[PDB]
Amino acid sequence: QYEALCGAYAITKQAISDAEYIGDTTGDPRPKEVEDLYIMTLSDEDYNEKRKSDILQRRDTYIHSIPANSEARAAAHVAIKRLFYKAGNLSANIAAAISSIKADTRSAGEALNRARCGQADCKAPDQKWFETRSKACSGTGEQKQGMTIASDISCLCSAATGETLCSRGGEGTAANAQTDWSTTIADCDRNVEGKAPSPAAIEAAIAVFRAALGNAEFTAFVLAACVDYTNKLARGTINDIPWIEQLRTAAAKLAGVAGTRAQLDGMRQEMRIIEDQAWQAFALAT
Amino acid sequence: YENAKQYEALCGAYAITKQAISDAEYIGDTTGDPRPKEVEDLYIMTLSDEDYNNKTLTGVTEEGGLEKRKSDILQRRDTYGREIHIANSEARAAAHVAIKRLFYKAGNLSANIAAAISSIKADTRSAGEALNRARCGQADCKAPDQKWFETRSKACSGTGEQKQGMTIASDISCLCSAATGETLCSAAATGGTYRGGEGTAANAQTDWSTTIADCDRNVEGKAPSPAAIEAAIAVFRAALGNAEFTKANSRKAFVLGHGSASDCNGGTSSAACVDYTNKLARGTINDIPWIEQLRTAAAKLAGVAGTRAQLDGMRQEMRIIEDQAWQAFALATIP
Amino acid sequence: AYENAKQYEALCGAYAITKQAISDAEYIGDTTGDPRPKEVEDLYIMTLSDEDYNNKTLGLEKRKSDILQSIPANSEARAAAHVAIKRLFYKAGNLSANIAAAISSIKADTRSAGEALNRARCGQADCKAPDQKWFETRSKACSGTGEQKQGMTIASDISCLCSAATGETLCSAAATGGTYRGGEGTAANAQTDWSTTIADCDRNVEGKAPSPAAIEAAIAVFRAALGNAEFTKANSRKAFVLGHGSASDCNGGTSSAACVDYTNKLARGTINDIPWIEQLRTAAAKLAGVAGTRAQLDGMRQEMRIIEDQAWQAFALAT
Ligand SMILES: *[C@@H]1O[C@H](CO)[C@@H](O[C@@H]2O[C@H](CO)[C@@H](O)[C@H](O)[C@H]2NC(C)=O)[C@H](O)[C@H]1NC(C)=O
Ligand SMILES: *[C@@H]1O[C@H](CO)[C@@H](O)[C@H](O)[C@H]1NC(C)=O
Ligand SMILES: *[C@@H]1O[C@H](CO)[C@@H](O)[C@H](O)[C@H]1NC(C)=O
Ligand SMILES: *[C@H]1O[C@H](CO)[C@@H](O)[C@H](O)[C@H]1O
Ligand SMILES: *[C@H]1O[C@H](CO)[C@@H](O)[C@H](O)[C@H]1O
Ligand SMILES: *[C@H]1O[C@H](CO)[C@@H](O)[C@H](O)[C@H]1O
Ligand SMILES: *[C@H]1O[C@H](CO)[C@@H](O)[C@H](O)[C@H]1O
């Protein structure tokens, strides 16, 4: 077999790229113009920073002025005061939304890693990744079945009677599994160029796993073999078996990045709108 | 122990049909959808003494609340101080048309916003009817009764009248009901009633809410997703196969069963099968009646996502219309 | 009998998407908001000063009388509302230019996507009529014995998988190709074994607009069907074969021989390296970029309409 096992390894060894979701970062801060225009409309008390220098210069053609010190300067100010506040109070929402995405992506990254490696220590092959071959692949004494992606490449790919079909029944092959990890990866780690994670790719891998579920050897939701996920299955759902649940939790956090993406793009457009709104309000002060 | 994977596929499809599509999961918040009260309140301001009265009955905007608020709009809702919310300069009149332009546009958008909501309401209910039409033979799917199955001969083997795939239940009933019993489909999977070729849909109903137990305990608190429908078909097509049958009209890969059969309208454990060759003529699994309804529901669930994008965009225009109204209101505050 | 249909249907789904039209106009809304709003151009002349008001710097009088069904009075706003309109005027001027580039970017992206679909089905971006250039020899298209032009086209893999001597409705619900028999690659014989084999797919086509997800979905369908666990000797990776089973060659005489052994063409175990899936991915990627550019297009149209609203607010100062 050995098809969904290495496939899930590539999906767990994908690359979460926060930058490909956050995107612009240029319109996210409060537009400099709605801040420069604001100061020039501060009447004759608050205006009198080293930033007044950048304003009233850099015409960019070959841009700003102190308007009439009448009520129109304050009349324009109260118009842009909300425009100034709206950008600043929207940039915080954009920044908070970015932190939501960054938390979700890494959390989905942790779930993707914790699905394969232990916690997040996949930099080196911990021995806790692989367990005994009676309580982890058979689950007799303790119900510790099918824990990780690599916790299943031990059974059906160790012991005897196999012509690399999956490229110590009862005992623990922890070190042999550590060696079998090197042999197994050699038939893997090709990756898929690590393009990006996708919630559909997790469901597709999950669905592909459900296809290979089944075997007609001697001791129903199984994959000799020594797998028998029915040990910890409890109710038939794979929502109990660990690595499927960890993959699903990662998809749930990854599902939220698109929702914040639609919110985030529209908020940036509003900032671009608030720029154009402000210039047509500086004319209020003639 | 025999037809376990096939049940897992059908139970997966049943799960989505048992899932509910709440309308508000797509419509969302509607407190900002209507015409903003700020742009309305600003419109009463730039009106002068004339046209500002209850007796303007010939033209009234939303003054069915007997006006009243016309003079009470000038409130004091601010910070520790009171600032917000009208003389009668030429700027007052010149600001009215600027508000009137956005006052119209906000109201038009409110109608357009409501129009997109009605599209979502219709599509979701139309989609909801489709999922039901797969689980039952109706758009309601209420009582596990009322004969939404058919005879064994017609529904499982397609001998008399080609009626395979009519409902996900019929395919579940045929696959999990035979004389020979085991943990074939589920734990309590014997299905003794629906055994003979003459076995009517009543027999299936009598052993329906006994083999469907695990499925209803496994439907989780999620919502149907168009990928979930396509996923449900993927596990279904993966399980379709039984290399043993009746030669002609035995196109396998269209058989949901096991072992030598020669029939699926019988008592043998093997006859716990459904041959679709007599319905899947075109050659596609997607021609099974509950597959099309699954795809019909998934298609409608993709349509509401786009209308949601239109709905969200309209509320953005409404909100920036509210801000632009204050800009036009600042025209009047000129000496 | 039908012994490759599970493999055939996966290939037929891809052929269905390639035989589908993207309709370059479905991703555009209208040519109303795209051009510069004439009202802003109209309001430009109502405050276009009194000098340069009819001085066309190489007409203006016809446009100044065009406004017939307020007054271009010489006040401050005649030069104090023009500046606000000027700021808006060229902002919408660049915006409509960017809109035109976005439309051209969409059209170029859809054509490149549509070319890729034709490239996967046929080998060229012009799927006009069945040509011998579409297929190649068994040695190349199916068995990989002599050259590695294996996954060139879906059309060659279909002809390799659904054509052999021994074959009763091997797939396609009607007949089996009887000329592409063994070393006789005869790409012309694969052309004779084409219209008979491909007629079911020319009925499975529907009004399903070519979508990025459907292309990735059909690839998953092919992934499931990719397998032949018996096959033959070294460099015969059994997971990367598409056939009945228990063979030693591909496209020979046996129905089993109707197989495609990508082992020689494939590398790093990535099916996303067979020619047709590559093009399918290229088409899917470009189609996604169409969605992104269309999202920009509607956003730009939104900014143009608000610019026109700002024009009156700027122009209302002249009263
Ligand atoms: C894009 O917007 C800019 C905004 O300035 C336009 O630039 C002006 O174009 C007018 C055209 O008659 C010239 O007279 C000005 O000298 C330009 N000013 C500057 C600062 O560039 C420009 O025309 C717009 N369109 C394009 C294609 O650039
Ligand atoms: C924006 O936030 C400031 C405080 O940071 C607050 O004083 C102001 O009222 C807010 N205005 C808006 C429009 O949100
Ligand atoms: C819709 O727009 C038209 C434009 O003439 C306007 O007369 C009408 O009042 C608008 N709708 C509403 C509900 O205001
Ligand atoms: C299913 O039922 C048949 C007929 O009784 C039996 O022969 C098989 O052994 C069983 O699995
Ligand atoms: C399916 O049923 C047949 C008898 O029809 C039996 O021989 C097989 O063992 C069973 O799987
Ligand atoms: C190819 O399939 C045919 C069916 O027509 C069978 O007769 C052969 O044995 C097989 O190789
Ligand atoms: C495929 O063709 C081989 C040729 O030997 C035959 O043995 C198999 O029975 C058939 O399916």
Author numbering:
A (entry chain A): 27 to 74, 88 to 101, 105 to 209, 218 to 269, 276 to 279, 294 to 356
B (entry chain C): 22 to 106, 108, 110 to 358
C (entry chain E): 21 to 78, 86 to 96, 107 to 356
From the primary publication:
Long-term immune evasion by the African trypanosome is achieved through repetitive cycles of surface protein replacement with antigenically distinct versions of the dense Variant Surface Glycoprotein (VSG) coat. The mature VSG proteins are attached to the cell surface by a GPI-anchor, and consist of two main regions: (1) a large, N-terminal domain (NTD) of roughly 300–400 amino acids that is most distal to the membrane and (2) a smaller, membrane-proximal C-terminal domain (CTD) spanning 80–120 amino acids beneath the NTD that harbors the GPI-anchor. Therefore, at the heart of antigenic variation in the African trypanosome are the NTDs of the VSGs. These large subdomains are elongated folds centered on a three-helix bundle scaffold.
VSG11 and VSG615 are related to VSG3 (the topologically-similar class of monomer/trimers with O-linked glycan PTMs), denoted as class B or N4 in the literature. NTD structures of VSG11 and VSG615 were solved to 1.23Å and 3.2Å resolution, respectively. Both reveal a fold similar to VSG3 as well as the presence of O-linked glycans on the top surface of the protein–one observed on VSG11 and two on VSG615. Interestingly, VSG615 crystallized with two trimers in the asymmetric unit, and these trimers align well with those of VSG3, VSG11, and VSG1954, providing additional support that class B trimer formation is not a crystallization artifact, but could represent the relevant, biological assembly. In contrast, in class B the bottom lobe residues are present at the N-terminal portion of the NTD sequence between the amino acids that form the first and second helices of the bundle. The second fact is that many of the class B VSGs are post-translationally modified by O-linked carbohydrates, whereas none of the class A VSGs have been found so modified. Finally, as noted in the Methods, the structures of VSG21, VSG545, VSG558, and VSG615 were solved by molecular replacement using an AlphaFold model of these VSGs as search models, indicating a very close fit of the model to the experimental data (a general idea for X-ray phasing implemented by several groups due to the accuracy of AlphaFold models).
